[PDB]
Amino acid sequence: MARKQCQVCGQPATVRVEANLNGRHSTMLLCDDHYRQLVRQQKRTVWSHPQFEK
Numbered sequence: 001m002a003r004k005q006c007q008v009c010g011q012p013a014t015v016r017v018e019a020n021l022n023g024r025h026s027t028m029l030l031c032d033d034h035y036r037q038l039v040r041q042q043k044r045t046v047w048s049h050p051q052f053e054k
């Protein structure tokens, strides 16, 4: 129950983000673009792309 929307914008959140805080399951709802932007803030872990590689 308790329908929540994107906490940033009033659009339907297609992504459910479950964050653990001291065991507490925090359910944060964001749109896809927001979530991608959020993960983007965390930098990129293991990503390789040819820059001058052939």
Ligand SMILES: [Zn+2]
Pocket: 006, 008, 009, 010, 011, 030, 031, 034
């Ligand atoms: Zn949104």
